[model samples]
Target: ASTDYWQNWTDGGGIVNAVNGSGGNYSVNWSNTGNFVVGKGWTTGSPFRTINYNAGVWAPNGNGYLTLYGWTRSPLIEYFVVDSWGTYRPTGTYKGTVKSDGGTYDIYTTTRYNAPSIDGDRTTFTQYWSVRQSKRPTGSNATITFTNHVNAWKSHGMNLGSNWAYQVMATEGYQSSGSSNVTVW
Candidate 1:
């Protein structure tokens, strides 16, 4: 796929618009590019990288992952804004797994309709997802829910003000004699 172009603003401060292959012809807008900083919990370089797992070592495998960069401190975040020059209603399901530091915990996540509008704005959009976490071998489980919404205003074509909201919830079970377990479904 190719990259899509769009504009972003943050709290009416920093403003930036980019069309990259990051989101499969999708674009992102923020109040300020400064408010957005890219961080990786397991990988390096951009938030986008390939999945590489060998024995216990993890390296880039060229699978293409989401990369978060140029971040600033803001209360509001508007994202997934697309360009009118291309298609709209970028929605789909994203499934992946997360393993604990010691591989003792395993988490499965499914994001449904993970779509964003192509109006080049995120002022009115919503995203939802479900998460399930379970312990290996023992079968303990935990479940979590997530809801993402857009909130805030943008100025200077790239500057976006802090104005977004997100909701998250989770459930777990107590440990027993056999083995402790937690799962999210």
Candidate 2:
């Protein structure tokens, strides 16, 4: 289940309507005090329409950064944060670095949840990734790489399900000042 983003997420991750965003930017001021508002996205269907972004942020008192999350139309997380429990969590094989030529990231890989029962949100055997850096990328310049299909780079023995639902670059703030700016790469 998803919530209404009011600003619409069908614009190829551009800062169209919800534009503090001038010229391809998903910019915003945030707060861990709970002021997290950003608007940008794109809708693509097929081969590969991954999310790539050049993120910038400044949160003197708090934090700001980019995070990518997606849902399969049905179940399955392909190879997401399988071991990364948003709160506290499972893990599997140590796949290896999902490297790319001019890669924007130095991704570490692994696996998780290879079961039958669908918990509430995700499925079993979903892939997971860790970005090595950017615990709180709310400084000045950062890169976001939500690229490839679930199984594009490396699939840890899992299915990508029927298809991908939505992949987005969202801004997060933690009692911070200044805006988190994002633009397409």
Candidate 3:
């Protein structure tokens, strides 16, 4: 199978849209939202390679996050490498910190009981997070050293299952307004 650009969203309130271009380029726009996620990236078969990403984002009002997001099957997991955020940042059980791509990230693990997942509605899964210790550097390609995070999680007993899903550089908002232009390679 071939991987290609794709977009996903679950609309709760407000308006949001995502567009995919050639290669790993995409754009998103939203306004006055409530519990929404919009992003564009490659739909991978399972494992993902190290990612190079760049984005210009403007998100004001409400609590939200701009993250490198994705999921996996088998064990059923959702993961986020948060780079930028709005008012509220989701914090979970403190797992520890990781150093990757010349930056530090705080690790967190959280569970969602019978919630929406890539599998479907009313599904249960664990959410893994790597919140950047510092804001993402601007005007340059940022790296998501996927294997680094994977290894770090393994060391912490947070195992991501074998099968992978859509790994997108995404923006999620809750009762907020924002827009983003992102490219991944």
- Top TM-score: which candidate number? 3
Q: Model 2: residues >4 Å from true position, as ranges?
A: 1-20, 34-39, 45-47, 50-52, 56-64, 76-95, 101-127, 130-149, 152-154, 173-178
Candidate 1 residue-wise lDDT at 125: 33
Q: Cα deviation in Å at residue 167, candidate 3?
A: 1.3
**Full-model lDDT, candidate 3:** 0.76
The whole-model C-alpha lDDT of candidate 2 against the native structure comes to: 0.40
Worst 10 residues of 2 by lDDT: 81-90
Give the clash count for model 1.
Answer: 51
lDDT of 3 by residue, 1-185 (tens): 12365756755577777676667667767777766666766677334477777775544466778787888888888998888787877789999999988888899999888777776667777999999877776447788878888888889999987887888777787777767777777
Q: Write the per-residue lDDT of candidate 2 for residues 93-181, one digit (tens) a residue.
A: 44444433233233443445533222344345544453332143333333433444244344544345575554455553334444445
Q: Give the least accurate 10-residue stretch of model 3, judged by summed lDDT.
A: 1-10
Please give the TM-score that candidate 3 achieves against the real structure: 0.89
All predictions: root-mean-square deviation over Cα?
18.9, 8.6, 2.3
Q: Deviation in angstroms for 37 in model 2?
A: 6.9
Best by lDDT: 3
**Worst 10 contiguous positions by lDDT, candidate 1:** 168-177
**lDDT (tens digit, per residue) of candidate 1 on 58-171:** 111121112111211142322321100111122335433322222321111223243333233433333221112321122222111111111111211223234222211101
Residue-level lDDT for 135 in candidate 1: 18
